[PDB]
């Protein structure tokens, strides 16, 4: 652009839109499980992904993934969600295992801190 | 006793009636370490043969670079098809601040201190071609001094 064209209208920095807008610049958000169900992946993959819908404390209603093998999550369960999408279109948040309603994945021995599993004492 | 360096090995393929025919291309660079550097590019149906062809083509087709105490004479710009390259002389002790292909070229060429940056496409072949074109177009104070028909008091 001509220097005069920039003087009259400067460069407009491209604005980046968040990928986790329901957190509102917070690392975690608390919400209640509205509906717990399963979903089928997309194309290449084939499974039954454990997912849940949760109304957050700021009013946002989002679908959140439940990682790990096995979960005891029912309706009205108040869980803690964090960012991190599932590549399962639509799901953009993860449920923190070991956070105030979601028990840790039982029988974990490796990467326990990622699933809220206490260290097995000898 | 020149140093030889393999920069990139890439597997290309041509399709025929029966199926795909996979061959390998290797891009290398050689240099004596005091101002001579040349790159070679060989395609072959196998990796060691491709590297051998690249080394033979690189041992020939070598250019001369006018170094200045192990660094560039002046900031130079090298350009090939998609890659635009900027190199700048640094002081003693900085090292080679450059990408992979640029690091290989400037290291086998004999350059010890340089601040470099690769713009556009970072394609290894075009990056080394731009680096070579920028280094061979770099002139020394004696060259400009003799080309101006005046002494070298600018040095």
């Amino acid at each position: 652009a001509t220097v005069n064209q920039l003087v009259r209208k400067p460069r407009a920095r491209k604005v980046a839109k968040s990928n986790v807008p329901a957190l509102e610049a917070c690392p975690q958000k608390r919400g209640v499980c509205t509906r717990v169900y399963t979903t089928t992946p997309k194309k290449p993959n084939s499974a039954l992904r454990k997912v849940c819908r949760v109304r957050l404390t700021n009013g946002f209603e989002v679908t959140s993934y439940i990682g790990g093998e096995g979960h005891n999550l029912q309706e009205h369960s108040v869980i803690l969600i964090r960012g991190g999408r599932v590549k399962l279109p639509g799901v953009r948040y993860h449920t923190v295992r070991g956070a105030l309603d979601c028990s840790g994945v039982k029988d974990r021995k490796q990467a326990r801190s990622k699933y809220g599993v206490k260290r097995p004492k000898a | 006793e020149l140093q030889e360096k393999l920069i990139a090995v890439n597997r290309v393929s041509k399709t025929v009636k029966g199926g795909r025919i996979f061959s390998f291309t290797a891009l290398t660079v050689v240099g004596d370490g005091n101002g001579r550097v040349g790159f070679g590019y060989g395609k072959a149906r196998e990796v060691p043969a491709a590297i051998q062809k690249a080394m033979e083509k690189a041992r020939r087709n070598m250019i001369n670079v006018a170094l200045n105490n192990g660094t560039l004479q002046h900031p130079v710009k090298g350009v090939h098809t998609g890659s635009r390259v900027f190199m700048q002389p640094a002081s003693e002790g900085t090292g080679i601040i450059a990408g992979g292909a640029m690091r290989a070229v400037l290291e086998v060429a004999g350059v010890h201190n340089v601040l470099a940056k690769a713009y556009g496409s970072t394609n290894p072949i075009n990056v080394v071609r731009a680096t070579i074109d920028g280094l061979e177009n770099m002139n020394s104070p004696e060259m400009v001094a003799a080309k101006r028909g005046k002494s070298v008091e600018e040095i």
Partner: protein, 129 residues
């Protein structure tokens, strides 16, 4: 229309050098003659002469060394659309000192190192490497 005759002189020099022209001719001017003087005393052109009285015609004799162009690069820095003025402590050096930068200081048109030794800044006319 013709709104930058100095850039036109630089372009004529560049195109005559790329076409292996022996000499280039152009309408003359005081600033053109000063820049041609700076180019000749630095060794980028062989000679220059101004012919004509009512319509002076400036003729620069281009220079070659090995059948190659003596002027590798010549760029207009300060231009009508964007004027570039520099102080003496920030005068530019072309080719890390191997090239020249024609600067128009209050004591006439001179090179960047001459303006530095004279303790002067001014308008950066062009870069000649």
């Amino acid at each position: 229309s013709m709104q930058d005759p100095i850039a036109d002189m630089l372009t004529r020099i560049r195109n005559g050098q790329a076409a292996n022209k022996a000499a280039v001719t152009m309408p003359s001017s005081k600033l053109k003659v000063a820049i041609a003087n700076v180019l000749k005393e630095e060794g980028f052109i062989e000679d220059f002469k101004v012919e004509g009285d009512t319509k002076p015609e400036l003729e620069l004799t281009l220079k070659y060394f090995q059948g190659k162009a003596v002027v590798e690069s010549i760029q207009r820095v300060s231009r009508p659309g964007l004027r570039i003025y520099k102080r003496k402590d920030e005068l530019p050096k072309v080719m890390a000192g191997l090239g020249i930068a024609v600067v128009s200081t209050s004591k006439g048109v001179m090179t960047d190192r001459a303006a530095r030794q004279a303790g002067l800044g001014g308008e950066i006319i062009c870069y000649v490497a």
